[PDB]
Amino acid sequence: PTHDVTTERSQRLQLRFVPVDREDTQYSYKTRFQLAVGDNRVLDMASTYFD
């Protein structure tokens, strides 16, 4: 298909989100991420692995 399939308005394929804030206690390592889902683009969390 040629039309109404792909964006072609200069958007990314992968996004790397640095944690907004994080704490490293002796037991664990908790990080908070603020992922923003564009304005029209949509994802499924089969992706979004933690690095």
């Binding site: 298909p1 109404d4 399939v5």
Partner: peptide, 24 residues
């Protein structure tokens, strides 16, 4: 939305639920 599907040619080519749950 048939135009969105990949076309086999002149005619576009064309299982919407999942059933996978079991304890063994």
């Amino acid at each position: 939305y048939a135009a969105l599907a990949p076309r086999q040619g002149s005619r576009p080519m064309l299982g919407i639920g999942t059933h996978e749950m079991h304890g063994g």
